[PDB]
Each structure stands twice: as C-alpha cells, then as structure tokens.
Amino acid sequence: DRQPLNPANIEARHHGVSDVPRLGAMDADEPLFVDDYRATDDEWTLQKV
Amino acid sequence: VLTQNVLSALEILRLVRLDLRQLAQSVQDTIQHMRFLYLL
Amino acid sequence: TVLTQNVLSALEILRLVRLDLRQLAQSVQDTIQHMRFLYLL
Amino acid sequence: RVRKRYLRQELRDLGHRVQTYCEDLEGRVSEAEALLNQQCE
Amino acid sequence: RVRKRYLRQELRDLGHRVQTYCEDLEGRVSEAEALLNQQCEL
Amino acid sequence: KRDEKHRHVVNVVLELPTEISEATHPVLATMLSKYTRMSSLFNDKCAFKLDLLRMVAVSRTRR
C-alpha cells in the first residue's frame, strides 16, 4: 500500500481449509497472502531468464 | 455412592477437547477476519 | 492401591482446570475492555 | 463511523461468546464429571 | 491509522496467548485421561 | 432462534436454490456451523459462495 511490508503484513494462505476471511480480503490490498514456499535462488534466476 | 464407570467419563473428556479445539479455531479465525475486514 | 490415588490426582487436575477456565473468560473480557477504552471510538 | 460501530459490536460479541463457551464448558466439566463419585443418585 | 496499528498489534498479542492457554488445558486434560485409563511410569 | 439465521445464510446470503437443502449437502451443514458464527461479510455474498465452492471442490478429490 505505502509502507514496506513488515512481516506482520505478509500472511500465509492455507489450502483445503475453509478460508472465507481471505476470500473477503480479495478486494483488499494491504495484506499479502502467499504460499508457504519461498522459491529458491536458482528458480529465481531461471524465472528471470 | 461408589466409583463409577470410566468409559462415559472418557467420552466427556473427549468432548472437552472437542470444545477446546473449537474455542481455539473460532477465536483465531475471528481475530483474523477482524484484522482483515476492519483494521484495513 | 494406585487406582484411587490416580483418581484423586485426576480430580485435582480437573478442579484446577475448572478454575483456569474462568481465568480464560475473565482475561478475555478484560482485554476487550482495555481495547474498547484505549482505541475503540 | 458505522464501521467503528460494526467493529465495537463484533468485539463485544466475541468477548461475550468466549464467555458463553467457557461457561458452558465449565458447566460440562463440573456436572458430567461429578458423576465419577456417584454424587447424584 | 495509528489506532488500527495498535489494535492489530494487541489483537495479535492476545491470539497466541489464548492459543497457549487452550493448549495447556488440552495437555492437562489428556494427562488426566491417560492417568485414568493407563497410568504410565511417574 | 437459529431458524432465521440459517434460512438467511442459505437462501438470502448464498442465493442457493431451495432444492439444495441441508440433506443434499452434509458439507453445507458443516459449513453453516461456521458461517453463522460471524455476522459480517454478508454484503459480499460472493465470498461465501466462492468459499463453499472451493470447499466442495477439495472435498471431492480422489486422493
């Protein structure tokens, strides 16, 4: 939004579990919902390529 | 008056965990959608 | 005999847990009151 | 301001609901487990 | 904005403490069940 | 009582057709066990529909 994301802003997304609060948050912008897979550096270079 | 059966007591002791887990998930989910819906 | 002693220990735990649950409720309500006083408009 | 009212209502209701869950659980742990000693005939 | 930040911090603060209390209660109850059904050593 | 809120979150909120009752979806009953616990997000019913849709999706896997 405006401030750099303090890790409290970055949140994981659960899969298979009921997740209506995240689906409500779809329109919202300040929080970040991420997969629990911090991609490796080699994949990072490969994707950049 | 006497020591009673243990199976029914164990059933109630399963139901108490049934309530604690619901407590935990409900309070966590409530504070979470409170954070997302209103605190933004 | 260990049977009745184990029953007594279990009921001690049960009573202290019953005591702790009221602490849970009271602390939750106290926190709600702190939040409403300090921040809620 | 309506959003503030929504937030205050939901916070108070969450507190009261936590209290209700805790009260019901404590009542269960008292009443049902009181049957261990055959207190009620 | 500052009120939202403080409320968010304090709500997050109560969440994990509630979880810890629930976990302690569950552990004590499970120990009670184990000691009632199959007492272990110590 | 609970009749109002469950009728509300089935027919009014979810817009789900009347023939889809609690009996035709056990997962629907398990979900309204959760849905009525919060009285917000009822203006954007699309969120509730998408949550129910993805829940029934994950319930219908093979593995």
UniProtKB/Swiss-Prot annotation, chain A:
It comes from the Viruses. It is found in: Virion; Host nucleus. Transmembrane segments: none annotated. Belongs to the herpesviridae major capsid protein family. Homomultimer. Makes the hexons and eleven out of twelve pentons. Interacts with triplex proteins 1/TRX1 and 2/TRX2; adjacent capsomers are linked together in groups of three by triplexes, heterotrimeric complexes composed of one molecule of TRX1 and two molecules of TRX2. Interacts with scaffold protein; this interaction allows efficient MCP transport to the host nucleus. Interacts with capsid vertex component 2/CVC2. Interacts with the small capsomere-interacting protein/SCP. Self-assembles to form an icosahedral capsid with a T=16 symmetry, about 200 nm in diameter, and consisting of 150 hexons and 12 pentons (total of 162 capsomers). Hexons form the edges and faces of the capsid and are each composed of six MCP molecules. In contrast, one penton is found at each of the 12 vertices. Eleven of the pentons are MCP pentamers, while the last vertex is occupied by the portal complex. This is Major capsid protein. It comes from Human cytomegalovirus (strain AD169). The gene is MCP. The chain holds residues 735 to 783 of 1370 of the full protein.
Swiss-Prot record, chain C:
It is found in: Virion tegument; Host cytoplasm; Host nucleus. It comes from the Viruses. Large tegument protein that plays multiple roles in the viral cycle. During viral entry, remains associated with the capsid while most of the tegument is detached and participates in the capsid transport toward the host nucleus. Plays a role in the routing of the capsid at the nuclear pore complex and subsequent uncoating. Within the host nucleus, acts as a deneddylase and promotes the degradation of nuclear CRLs (cullin-RING ubiquitin ligases) and thereby stabilizes nuclear CRL substrates, while cytoplasmic CRLs remain unaffected. Interacts with host CUL1 and CUL4A; these interactions inhibit the E3 ligase activity of cullins. Interacts with inner tegument protein. Interacts with capsid vertex specific component CVC2. Interacts with the major capsid protein/MCP. Belongs to the herpesviridae large tegument protein family. This is Large tegument protein deneddylase. It comes from Human cytomegalovirus (strain AD169). The chain holds residues 2201 to 2241 of 2241 of the full protein.
From Swiss-Prot, chain D:
It is found in: Virion; Host nucleus. It comes from the Viruses. Transmembrane segments: none annotated. Heterodimerizes with CVC1. Interacts with major capsid protein/MCP and triplex capsid protein 1/TRX1 at the pentamer vertices. Interacts with the large tegument protein/LTP. Belongs to the herpesviridae CVC2 protein family. Capsid vertex-specific component that plays a role during viral DNA encapsidation, assuring correct genome cleavage and presumably stabilizing capsids that contain full-length viral genomes. Participates in the interaction between the capsid and the tegument through interaction with the large tegument protein/LTP. This is Capsid vertex component 2. It comes from Human cytomegalovirus (strain AD169) (HHV-5). The lineage of its organism: Viruses, Duplodnaviria, Heunggongvirae, Peploviricota, Herviviricetes. The gene is CVC2. The chain holds residues 55 to 95 of 642 of the full protein.
Curated annotation (Swiss-Prot), chain F:
The keyword Transcription does not apply. The gene is SCP. This is Small capsomere-interacting protein. Keywords: Capsid protein, Host nucleus, Virion. Interacts with the major capsid protein/MCP. Participates in the assembly of the infectious particles by decorating the outer surface of the capsid shell and thus forming a layer between the capsid and the tegument. Complexes composed of the major capsid protein and small capsomere-interacting protein/SCP assemble together in the host cytoplasm and are translocated to the nucleus, where they accumulate and participate in capsid assembly. One of its GO terms (biological process) is viral process. The lineage of its organism: Viruses, Duplodnaviria, Heunggongvirae, Peploviricota, Herviviricetes. Belongs to the herpesviridae small capsomere-interacting protein family. GO terms for cellular component: host cell nucleus; viral capsid. It is found in: Virion; Host nucleus.
